[PDB]
From Swiss-Prot:
Domain notes per entry: The PPIase FKBP-type domain contributes to the chaperone activity. Required for the inhibition of calcineurin phosphatase activity.
Lineage: Eukaryota, Sar, Alveolata, Apicomplexa, Aconoidasida
Gene designation: FKBP35
Portion of the parent chain present: 7 to 127 of 304
Subcellular localization, as worded in the UniProt entry: Cytoplasm; Nucleus
Listed name of the protein: Peptidyl-prolyl cis-trans isomerase FKBP35
Assembly and interaction partners: Homodimer. Interacts (via TPR repeats) with HSP90 (probably via MEEVD motif).
Length: 122
């Protein structure tokens, strides 16, 4: 499995589950609205905290605008259209010491599957 470090400290590590368009490297760019599916779980307890797959509602955000946690901007920036990946995001690139509400404690390593479906620009 194609497995790579997206930050030099190993804080964001991506394993490719299914290769996308690697032949033509069809990759989104900063500012593009991206459409993905995802599932997120805590590495510590294994608890799944969210799944757009189970909702069956694809998730949209603008890439590299700080709309999402840094490890996501870094991860999705590296994905080819139709790629499915597993990404491990250390707390510094996630929610840090604060965590996120009742579902994500402080100092949490996060594991997400992300599937890049589509992207667009105005
Ligand atoms: C119901 O489900 C939520 C998503 C939930 C929230 C809580 C968590 C556990 C989680 O379960 O997703 C989760 O799985 C998670 O950790 N995610 C979601 C998928 C992307 C990665 C991560 C994340 O960054 O969430 C994000 C995290 C929770 C908060 C941000 C982290 C980065 C930091 O820089 C931001 O500060 C600004 C805050 C939430 C989001 O991905 C969304 C889309 C973005 C916003 C809320 C903020 O960026 C915001 O600015 C204020 C905006 O500018 C936006 C686009 C305005 C529009 C109208 C709002 C859309 C809201 C959609 C929210 C929905 C689908």
């Amino acid at each position: 499995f194609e497995k790579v470090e997206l930050t030099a400290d190993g804080g964001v590590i991506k394993t490719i589950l299914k290769k996308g368009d690697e032949g033509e490297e069809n990759i989104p760019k900063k500012g593009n609205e991206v459409t993905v599916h995802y599932v997120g779980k805590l590495e510590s307890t294994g608890k799944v905290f969210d799944s757009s797959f189970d909702r069956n509602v694809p998730f949209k955000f603008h890439l590299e605008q700080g709309e999402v946690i840094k490890g996501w901007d870094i991860c999705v920036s590296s994905m080819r259209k139709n790629e499915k990946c597993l990404v491990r995001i250390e707390s510094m690139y996630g929610y840090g010491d604060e965590g996120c509400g009742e579902s994500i404690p402080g100092n949490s390593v996060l594991l997400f599957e992300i599937e890049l479906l589509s992207f667009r620009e105005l």
